[PDB]
Swiss-Prot record, chains A, B:
Function as written in the Swiss-Prot or TrEMBL entry: Aspartyl protease that mediates proteolytic cleavages of Gag and Gag-Pol polyproteins during or shortly after the release of the virion from the plasma membrane. Cleavages take place as an ordered, step-wise cascade to yield mature proteins. This process is called maturation. Displays maximal activity during the budding process just prior to particle release from the cell. Also cleaves Nef and Vif, probably concomitantly with viral structural proteins on maturation of virus particles. Hydrolyzes host EIF4GI and PABP1 in order to shut off the capped cellular mRNA translation.
Whole sequence portion shown: 491 to 589 of 1437
Stretch list, region Dimerization of protease: 1-5, 49-55, 88-99
Name the record gives this protein: Protease
Residue ranges of every copy of the Peptidase A2 domain listed in the record: 20-89
Residues at the active site: D25 (for protease activity)
Amino acid sequence: PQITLWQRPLVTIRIGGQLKEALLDTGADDTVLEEMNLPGKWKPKMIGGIGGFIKVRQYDQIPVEIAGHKAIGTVLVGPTPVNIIGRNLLTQIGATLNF
Amino acid sequence: PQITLWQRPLVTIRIGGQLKEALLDTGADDTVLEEMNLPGKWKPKMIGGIGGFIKVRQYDQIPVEIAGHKAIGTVLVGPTPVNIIGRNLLTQIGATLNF
Ligand SMILES: CCCC[C@@H](CN[C@@H](CCCC)C(=O)N[C@@H](CCC(N)=O)C(=O)N[C@@H](CCCNC(N)=[NH2+])C(N)=O)NC(=O)[C@@H](NC(=O)[C@@H](NC(C)=O)[C@@H](C)O)[C@@H](C)CC
């Protein structure tokens, strides 16, 4: 599908068992989700945005389905204001910007 | 064009007499430039994201050119680690996400 930017580029994703709402974001290297439990082993990491640094926890190899598209890779969970889908998963689904 | 997301999508824009590199960000509601001396009245404000809020200056009706496509709109100036082009302006040059 083609998505226009007059509205927030918001999509439903399954994070297995559950359904969430995430923001397709070109401006994010990685994927970060609101604090939730996942089936995995994790390691503490730090990421940045406009206001500074935050501690998150990394989960390697989690299958995510973005609008019915399949992706398998890293997922960071911590105190992010909006769930966001980064370039790490977008490239798996073959997302590009057109103008 | 068609920009792939293997790397951060960085483009050259013109604001004032300057050519600058900015990140195309579908997860930014607004456009935010790093500290720069523009003429004009501004109103102050706060924007946040990962990490917290930073204080910035709001300038209205500032004409740009995002890689040879003109736009006009509000731009925020403050201490961002990077120049960011939000949707306010991407909506003007006809950019979509496609997968
Ligand atoms: C230097 C900043 C670079 C741009 C920025 C775009 N992020 C959006 C994300 C979506 C909301 C969290 C952002 O801050 N958006 C603001 C930006 C500036 C602005 N405020 O216009 C925005 O829309 N904020 C909303 C408030 C949050 C709600 N969301 C929303 N309305 N869309 C708003 N209107 O003010 N990227 C990020 O915030 C991401 N950070 C990175 O990609 C950083 N990478 C690492 C490895 O840490 C790198 C640059 O150091 C992700 C990967 C963190 C792991």
